[PDB]
Design a protein around this ligand. Structure first.
Ligand SMILES: *[C@H]1C(C#N)=C(O)C(C)(C)[C@@H]2CC[C@]3(C)C(=CC(=O)[C@@H]4[C@@H]5CC(C)(C)CC[C@]5(C(=O)O)CC[C@]43C)[C@@]12C
Ligand SMILES: *[C@H]1C(C#N)=C(O)C(C)(C)[C@@H]2CC[C@]3(C)C(=CC(=O)[C@@H]4[C@@H]5CC(C)(C)CC[C@]5(C(=O)O)CC[C@]43C)[C@@]12C
Lengths: 132, 132
């Protein structure tokens, strides 16, 4: 006689916590980012293409390429330092990003490169506050 | 001289919206649930193992099986009606579930089967309210 409709607000926060745990456990991962910047030593980041796609229109375009790979893809990344890539992956998984004030510019450059619009705004607003 | 730390509250809600769009687009999917219940016609649900794993300890256990499949897995499901499975998948992707009051019991049974604790609580509390 009625339509019972439930909603849990905390769900998306809760699921992303499990998603991040799975990432750190290197479980259910389907992409390895291979980050090589200048003289910096090479770094690998394991991740889920969906989670990266859900936070970045650049990763979404990269991974939604009509037909699907049979499992693990290595994506060669250049132009971002491994430490920057690390922070942007962590943002995608946690909704949080952290950096020292001297590298807000370099995190912004990475966020522009991966079209992570919210952290571009955050970084540009922070840099503008550091002015008279 | 300082630690700049940004956080976007809306991110997890925003990403799940993209995740659900990708599901309906049948993009980046790595599992097909093949649901056969009693006399009901067979149904297929495309999904992302991570998203199902992040919302269900039963799917998490199912998919975190030490070693990974090369792409698309078909999972044969029995004991839940396709309409129940549909609602529980949609919950995992949207944080929302909807049913008519006569089938709160059958949705609960599905949610117990997949250990989706929040909707078990919702359903059990609703059934208990329908009493004197
Ligand atoms: C600066 C910093 C602080 N405080 C950080 O929190 C992170 C985000 C971890 C930065 C990572 C990138 C890195 C290593 C960096 C500082 C830094 O000086 C280098 C450096 C900057 C210049 C010289 C402009 C280009 C090269 C280089 C590098 O060393 O390769 C790029 C990366 C960057 C910005 C932080 C440690
Ligand atoms: C009842 C309903 C309402 N109102 C719903 O919103 C959903 C959740 C869509 C239900 C899906 C499952 C289904 C088809 C159902 C009603 C119903 O009577 C059947 C039926 C119940 C019994 C007879 C107890 C067992 C068999 C059966 C079936 O038809 O296979 C199981 C599924 C169920 C509960 C809703 C339409």
């Amino acid at each position: 006689n009625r339509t019972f409709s439930y909603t849990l607000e905390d769900h998306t926060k809760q699921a992303f916590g499990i998603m991040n745990e799975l990432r750190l456990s290197q479980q259910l991962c389907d992409v390895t980012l291979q980050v090589k910047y200048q003289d910096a030593p090479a770094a690998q980041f394991m991740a889920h293409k969906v989670v990266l796609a859900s936070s970045s229109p650049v990763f979404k375009a990269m991974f939604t390429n009509g037909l699907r790979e049979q499992g693990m893809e290595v994506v060669s990344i250049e132009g971002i330092h491994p430490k920057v890539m690390e922070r942007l992956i962590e943002f995608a998984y946690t909704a949080s990003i952290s950096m020292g004030e001297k590298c807000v510019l370099h995190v912004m450059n990475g966020a522009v490169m991966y079209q992570i619009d919210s952290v571009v705004r955050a970084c540009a607003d922070f840099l503008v506050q550091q002015l008279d």
